[PDB]
Design an enzyme around this catalytic site. Structure first.
Site, PDB file in Angstrom:
ATOM      1  N   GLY A  31       9.381  23.585 -30.190  1.00 26.44           N
ATOM      2  CA  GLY A  31       8.345  22.618 -29.876  1.00 26.44           C
ATOM      3  C   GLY A  31       8.770  21.580 -28.851  1.00 26.44           C
ATOM      4  O   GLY A  31       9.457  21.884 -27.869  1.00 26.44           O
ATOM      5  N   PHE A  32       8.373  20.337 -29.090  1.00 23.88           N
ATOM      6  CA  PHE A  32       8.684  19.246 -28.182  1.00 23.88           C
ATOM      7  C   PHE A  32      10.091  18.711 -28.394  1.00 23.88           C
ATOM      8  O   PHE A  32      10.396  18.161 -29.455  1.00 23.88           O
ATOM      9  CB  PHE A  32       7.652  18.130 -28.379  1.00 23.88           C
ATOM     10  CG  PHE A  32       7.806  16.956 -27.440  1.00 23.88           C
ATOM     11  CD1 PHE A  32       7.982  17.150 -26.072  1.00 23.88           C
ATOM     12  CD2 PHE A  32       7.693  15.652 -27.921  1.00 23.88           C
ATOM     13  CE1 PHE A  32       8.038  16.056 -25.195  1.00 23.88           C
ATOM     14  CE2 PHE A  32       7.746  14.556 -27.054  1.00 23.88           C
ATOM     15  CZ  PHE A  32       7.917  14.759 -25.690  1.00 23.88           C
ATOM     16  N   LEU A  33      10.947  18.882 -27.391  1.00 27.78           N
ATOM     17  CA  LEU A  33      12.314  18.380 -27.470  1.00 27.78           C
ATOM     18  C   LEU A  33      13.028  18.702 -28.792  1.00 27.78           C
ATOM     19  O   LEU A  33      13.550  17.803 -29.456  1.00 27.78           O
ATOM     20  CB  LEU A  33      12.289  16.858 -27.261  1.00 27.78           C
ATOM     21  CG  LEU A  33      12.533  16.201 -25.890  1.00 27.78           C
ATOM     22  CD1 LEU A  33      12.635  17.208 -24.771  1.00 27.78           C
ATOM     23  CD2 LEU A  33      11.431  15.220 -25.641  1.00 27.78           C
ATOM     24  N   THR A  87       9.056  19.773 -33.222  1.00 29.40           N
ATOM     25  CA  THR A  87       7.835  18.988 -33.330  1.00 29.40           C
ATOM     26  C   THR A  87       6.694  19.659 -32.581  1.00 29.40           C
ATOM     27  O   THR A  87       6.856  20.085 -31.426  1.00 29.40           O
ATOM     28  CB  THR A  87       8.019  17.571 -32.735  1.00 29.40           C
ATOM     29  OG1 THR A  87       8.945  16.827 -33.538  1.00 29.40           O
ATOM     30  CG2 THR A  87       6.687  16.834 -32.675  1.00 29.40           C
TER      31      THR A  87
END
Ligand code: HEC
Ligand code: HEC
Ligand SMILES: [Cu+2]
Ligand SMILES: [Cu+2]
Ligand code: NA
Ligand code: NA
Lengths: 382, 125, 147, 105, 382, 125, 105, 147
Positions: free
Chosen positions: A74-76, A93
């Site tokens: 996901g995100f970072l 995330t």
């Protein structure tokens, strides 16, 4: 579109072999491959994709220079790899509408061969610290049963994740300290704003016992966000912008500060040599050596790629070598076996260059590794 | 150009990474996805908190404090990327760290990075 | 001689309220005449100054004057600009400020005040070059405070 | 709620009456960390340096929701009127190491 | 580091203001911008990102060659644009765990100025047809009250979404037909495998009313997936692999096949000229003209970029002009105003070249449009 | 090379777009992300249905029918992209259309594209 | 519920029972579109061309969920024993234009 | 002459069971001698041929030999590969297959078979170039079928 000197090789082999099955009338019957069992030469490459909403990790066999698998993120996301090779995982995330809407933080655990998820542990109230990927901002306990991740806002804290039981345990209130270096099943260290180190001991409940070490570095000495930490050898290698290297021995369960060492020669620092990149330092346990990405640069260009990597004796601080990488390298690491491999990753060329740690010669490479590959993770097996 | 060479600021093109207010920007220049030098693009959320840096202005020879607030709630613009680190300190000195996603305080709790603005919040040293 | 006024209502500070004991000391004489505090960074004096602060100011201003119930006293920002000088700092102690901060003439003598002041200025955490109440020999000798 | 907000946006410090309850913010710190006041008083924070600072009370402290105060630029002020006794901790959003508390009696 | 002349001027002009602003004593007070009101020269470029899990749509002012906004998207979404500029929307798809997990098809509607979603209508049972982005595989009825999307499995169907009441209505049963070309609030035609066009009038309930037209093309004539359709002029311009064009007038509410026309000349076809690309055709309603991407190429490279664009009289089939684009263009389109702009999108360069539709001269460009932009969309206003 | 020039198949490197079994592949070559010429990579889901094409084999001069099944449940590999269209017909002739996401039948209903395999399912004309 | 699968995956055509109900597939079509069978029979589709085909019953026909039979390569089979009586429409997954029907009386 | 065998068990077809009416037609003879059906695409026969196939086959094989209760007969695929030629097709009708497809030598005359066969060929939807049961001239005037 280009093919690495190792890509053609693997490509022809596949051809030659297919052509053969054909000629022998062996019918193609597609199935879902399994990856080769993790080993010392396996290397993971994470692509934070320049802070894009979705990310990718590439499982690479450093020996043949081949992609043997991949895992979406996901995100970072923060990745981790069990040193024994029994499993891999990460704190990720996602959102309900690409980059907007309900946020959901979680931890996923994967089987190193099927790459299938064996666990999907949700983390209450988006506790993850959304920051450019720092390996030690999410770490495993020595017994690989707990996952520890950092939380920046609204205040410093670390969440405890029970991997064995597959569930979120709790958040730990911590001083204004950063990073996580687990030294035991219930103990881990942190770096604090005041320059000290923080020892955190936590039970199953109640306030954790926290104790600070002596301040081991001046207020104007800056310790990079990518220090090297060998959990097995409890060795913590932390470089500063200038290349000065602080070493902390955590084997004894307590911080023992080794004599500092300068990774760049007096002459080099005079001509403007300084470390630089993302994952600037690597540490080989068995050999007890340090590898530092360096190059000539102004003092505020610490995140730019470097074309050189110097090796030194962790104990004495004796210069051992200085390799010319031939490319703009952002991150390096090494395999922890006999004659280790020196991994050099370029975020620009989205390519992973594999070198002989001993000679510094480039053996092969792998490209098209995402949009902005930055983190190299290996397993210390055996 | 040379990535390792000292940063040389200019005051004539805000879409270039060598524009003076960007001396410590990380990410993408908002002016390249619908925003402006100091405003977020339509549909994004404006963060309140952020990291800062003292950027030198070659035009008047003064140094100003830039508050690198992020525009959030959108996937990375992917247009006009820059990474400068003049005076950028490690994460244990957050007030000057730019690897952090400075989206705190943005409307609707947006925490995804889209782009960064370079507004002046005061004079520096 | 420097004007001594109450930092809030500007009314002249009445020294008849000062304890009769401790007005004679050369320091007090030199201070009142030149607004200079001869005790600033005086090794012989520092030990008792630190203690004088302990029993009288730490309770409200912090152990190292970093601030607590009352504003911090160890950095360059003063709620009352005058406190950037020893005549101003003295005026604040003697006449008081607002709230909890009252005059100190009943609990401290003129000399004891100048000493406490010397300890406060010693807790300064800014850079020597900024200590505009110090004299060169004191500056070069003084080093930003640290616990 | 435990507090009401006089002004939603930061305002010019020069507009603060002398004598008003004040907590200055400078050198990366709230000059008066443990401010003590009485119910009904209004506390005004003032940023004295270039570095932006705000006050942030997590949820459940000053009411159901968290109060994420706006960033004050140099010479800007922010106020809060406390209507109920108690101790309310806070921190600076981008600088979690900056902390303070208001004691309303 | 590469900036186009347009964004360089924009950048310069922007510096000019910020400099004079500072000097004049103006303070920066960041806010969230509104996009400039929709207009003829407003152009939309959607980036399918080579079938990535997340996509991006760029909102551009073709006049200034500036990006005035963006809109995030899911897997291979379908974009629509109210001709009157009152709103924009799309049919998207997303999964609970990046590219895996629970699937969710939905329709979002956006304010043309604030780009804020004004409606988020979920679609039942992942009905969306996941395929390379084809403009007319999701369509808006003339009134702008209903959105129609295609379904390929388990059987050909077209879903009806009530934009006004922000709700999904039902799934209509249709024959082996593809594409949706609305002509009225309750009517749209489809192309069928049997070479006929199909009229599908549907109501609030009950099986739709269907009728076929005469077969209008032989079985060995292939109609590209990207026909040009002007809902205002009821014109449907459909090319073939060879350039032969099939125009179908629907303005009367009923099909009416016009004189087939050959976009490429006798000389050209002989010299191997053939249309090729993604969005190969464009049609200007007012000038009643046809634009087609062409070049010399083998007969099976019908999806590669083309370097030329020819313009013909939709009525007389007369050759109006032939432009040398100077780039590898994959898609084209035009603004519908008096003196139209000729948009030429290159997937390879992730660049949009904006030319003058009359002279074919390149006026300005806009780069960095995703990882593989393929669809250009403009609204017909007035 | 020339993108518009006739497709010239080769039988010596399956990671190149001119490899003979790829004459009508769209997307990415699985062998470049953990799979093989005919098998999906670890963790992905193998589709059953797919589009096809008659590809000529320069080695034996015969033509075989390739069933371009997709490996799904993963975001595009992004490695080794290719787009060939020998005999590729418009969507109204699905059996030969390659813009369609051929993930039908894959386990767990995976419908996201990751990469494509080039298995032979028979001889053609 | 309304039928069973004698074999989960397609088997070589060779193993097909002589005299056993068969519906060959070729030239893009179920050669026998309206097959009529009686309760108990076991219909066996057999592919005769290179183009892979299969049988696909939407949900609610042969039971609660749809039956997406496997793709048969040239000379492969797949059987289905029809339990209940009634008409059962099916089609080929990738080829929606390939329809079939199996009436059970 | 051609080999007339039962498409299933291989045994020679016994033409002694063939009705006596219609064993003399110039077509039946030419066919038995050469193996060629002169009735293929024969304008003066089709009309009737179609009627034969209409009430004799359409019931199981469909209104256009597309298939229904039985298999399709209008394409290049043949369960019994020989049926791609008139000699094989003949043997199929005469000797029978399996199930509800048994020997036609009882209901059809040797001539009615060749006529019906002619119509079955006319229904072919494949490509002329493929109609291997047709002379060149006939391939030239042949158009794949369409209702
Ligand atoms: C609590 C009863 C206090 C004790 C004991 C001391 N001080 Fe104080 N001081 C107190 C308050 C509440 C305030 C704020 C006054 C206001 O009007 O804001 C102060 C302030 C000062 C100052 C002014 C600092 C500035 O920023 O200008 C000074 C110089 C000061 N106090 C000195 C001081 C000394 C030397 C003390 C020990 C003898 C001392 N204070 C005790 C509350 C209290
Ligand atoms: C139902 C009682 C039928 C009628 C009337 C006709 N046919 Fe038939 N035919 C039937 C079946 C069930 C089968 C399948 C036989 C098998 O075991 O495969 C057939 C088959 C044929 C064939 C073979 C075609 C092939 O697949 O190779 C032919 C050439 C044929 N039938 C011809 C034919 C003609 C000319 C008919 C009208 C006189 C006719 N059939 C009627 C069932 C029935
Ligand atoms: Cu702060
Ligand atoms: Cu089929
Ligand atoms: Na102070
Ligand atoms: Na047939």
């Amino acid at each position: 579109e280009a093919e690495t000197q190792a890509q053609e090789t693997q490509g022809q082999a596949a051809a030659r072999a297919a052509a053969a099955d054909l000629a022998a009338g062996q019918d193609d019957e597609p199935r879902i491959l399994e990856a080769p069992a993790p080993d010392a030469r396996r290397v993971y490459v994470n692509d934070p994709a320049h802070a894009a909403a979705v990310t990718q990790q590439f499982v690479i066999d450093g020996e043949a220079g081949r992609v043997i698998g991949m895992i979406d993120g996901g995100f970072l996301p923060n990745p981790v790899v069990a040193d024994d090779g029994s499993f891999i995982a990460h704190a990720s995330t996602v959102f309900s509408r690409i980059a907007r809407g309900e946020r959901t933080d979680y931890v996923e655990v994967f089987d190193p061969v099927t790459l299938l998820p064996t666990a999907d542990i949700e983390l209450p109230d988006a506790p993850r610290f959304l920051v450019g990927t720092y390996p030690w901002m999410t770490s495993l306990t020595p017994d690989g049963k707990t996952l520890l991740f950092y939380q920046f806002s609204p205040a410093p804290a670390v969440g405890v994740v029970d991997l064995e039981g597959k569930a979120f345990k709790r958040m730990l209130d911590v001083p204004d300290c950063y990073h996580i270096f687990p030294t035991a099943p219930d103990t881990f260290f942190m770096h604090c704003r005041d320059g000290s180190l923080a020892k955190v001991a936590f039970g199953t409940e109640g306030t954790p016992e926290i104790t600070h070490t002596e301040v081991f570095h001046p207020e104007d000495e800056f310790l990079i966000n990518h220090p090297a930490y060998s959990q097995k050898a409890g060795r913590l290698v932390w470089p500063t912008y200038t290349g000065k290297i602080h070493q902390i021995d955590l084997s004894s369960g307590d911080a023992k500060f080794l004599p500092a060492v300068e990774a760049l020669t007096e002459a080099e620092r005079a001509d403007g040599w300084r470390p630089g990149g993302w994952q600037q330092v690597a540490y080989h346990r068995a050999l007890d050596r340090i590898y530092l990405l360096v190059d000539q640069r102004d003092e505020w260009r610490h995140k730019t790629a470097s074309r050189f990597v110097v090796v030194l004796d962790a104990k004495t601080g004796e210069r051992l070598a200085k390799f010319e990488m031939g490319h703009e390298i952002d991150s390096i690491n090494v395999s922890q076996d006999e004659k280790p491999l020196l991994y050099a990753l370029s975020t620009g060329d989205k390519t992973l260059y594999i070198h002989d740690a001993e000679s510094g010669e480039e053996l092969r490479s792998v490209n098209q590794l995402g949009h902005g590959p930055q983190v190299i993770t290996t397993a210390d097996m055996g | 150009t040379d990535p390792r060479a000292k940063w040389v600021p200019q005051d004539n093109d805000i879409q270039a990474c060598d524009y003076w207010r960007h001396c410590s920007i990380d990410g993408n220049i908002c002016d390249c996805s619908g925003g402006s030098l100091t405003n977020c693009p339509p549909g994004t959320k404006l963060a309140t908190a952020s990291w800062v840096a003292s950027c030198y202005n070659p035009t008047d020879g003064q140094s100003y404090l830039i508050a690198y607030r992020d525009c959030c709630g959108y996937n990375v613009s992917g247009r006009c990327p820059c990474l400068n680190t003049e005076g950028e300190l490690p994460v244990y000195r957050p007030e000057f760290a730019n690897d952090i996603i400075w989206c705190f305080g943005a409307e609707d709790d947006a925490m995804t990075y889209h782009c960064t603005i370079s507004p002046i919040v005061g004079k520096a040293s | 001689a420097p004007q001594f006024f109450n930092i809030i209502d500007g009314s002249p500070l009445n020294f008849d309220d000062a304890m009769e004991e401790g007005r004679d000391t050369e320091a007090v004489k030199h201070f009142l005449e030149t607004g200079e505090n001869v005790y600033n960074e005086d090794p012989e004096i520092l030990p008792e100054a630190e203690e004088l602060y302990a029993g009288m100011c730490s309770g409200c201003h912090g152990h190292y004057a970093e601030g607590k119930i009352g504003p911090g006293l160890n950095d360059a920002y003063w709620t009352y600009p005058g406190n950037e000088t020893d005549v101003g700092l003295f005026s604040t102690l003697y006449g008081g400020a607002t709230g909890q901060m009252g005059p100190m003439w009943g609990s401290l003598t003129l000399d004891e005040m100048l000493r406490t002041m010397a300890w406060v200025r010693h807790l300064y955490t800014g850079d020597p070059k900024d200590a505009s109440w110090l004299t060169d020999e004191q500056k070069a000798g003084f080093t930003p405070f640290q616990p | 709620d435990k507090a009401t907000i006089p002004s939603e946006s930061p305002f010019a410090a020069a507009e603060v009456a002398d004598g008003a309850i004040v907590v200055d913010i400078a050198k990366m710190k709230y000059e008066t960390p443990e401010l003590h006041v009485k119910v009904g008083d209004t506390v005004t924070w003032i940023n004295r340096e270039a570095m932006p600072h705000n006050v942030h009370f997590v949820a459940g402290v000053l009411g159901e929701a968290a109060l994420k105060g706006p960033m004050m630029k140099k010479e800007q002020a922010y106020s809060l009127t406390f209507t109920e006794a108690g101790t309310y901790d806070y921190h600076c959003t981008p600088h979690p190491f900056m902390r303070g508390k208001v004691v309303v009696e």
